[PDB]
Design brief:
Largest sheet: 4 strands, antiparallel
Shape: globular
EC number: 5.2.1.8
Domain PpiC: 1-94
Function: Isoform 1 is involved as a ribosomal RNA processing factor in ribosome biogenesis. Binds to tightly bent AT-rich stretches of double-stranded DNA. Isoform 2 binds to double-stranded DNA.
Number of domains: 1
CATH class: Alpha Beta
GO molecular function, one term: bent DNA binding
Structural class: alpha+beta
Distance between the termini: 5 Å
Subunit structure: Isoform 1 is found in pre-ribosomal ribonucleoprotein (pre-rRNP) complexes.
CATH topology: Chitinase A, domain 3
């Protein structure tokens, strides 16, 4: 009853389009994550399985509500999510 979410958190600058293109696939996930890793102490990039999920509202709600049909949704939440605390790119490797 949990999901696997791996994302990188960075401040909002307007490069959302530059982050997804630079992220391309899991090939540069570490490259963009390390450069966009502004929450290493609070987060390690991946939270693993989450049965409930309680971090904000839209970020989690979507994590547990991610649709199963999507051309680029079975990997990264495209487009990514934009919030007042910066933008976030989540990668789902497991689903409830």
């Amino acid at each position: 009853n949990a999901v696997k979410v791996r994302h990188i958190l960075c401040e909002k600058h307007g490069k959302i389009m530059e982050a997804m293109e630079k992220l391309k696939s899991g090939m540069r996930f570490n490259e963009v994550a390390a450069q966009y890793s502004e929450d290493k102490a609070r987060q390690g990039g991946d939270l693993g399985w989450m049965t409930r999920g309680s971090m904000v509202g839209p970020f989690q709600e979507a994590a547990f509500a991610l649709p199963v049909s999507g051309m680029d949704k079975p990997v990264f939440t495209d487009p990514p999510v934009k919030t007042k605390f910066g933008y976030h790119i989540i990668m789902v490797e497991g689903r409830k």
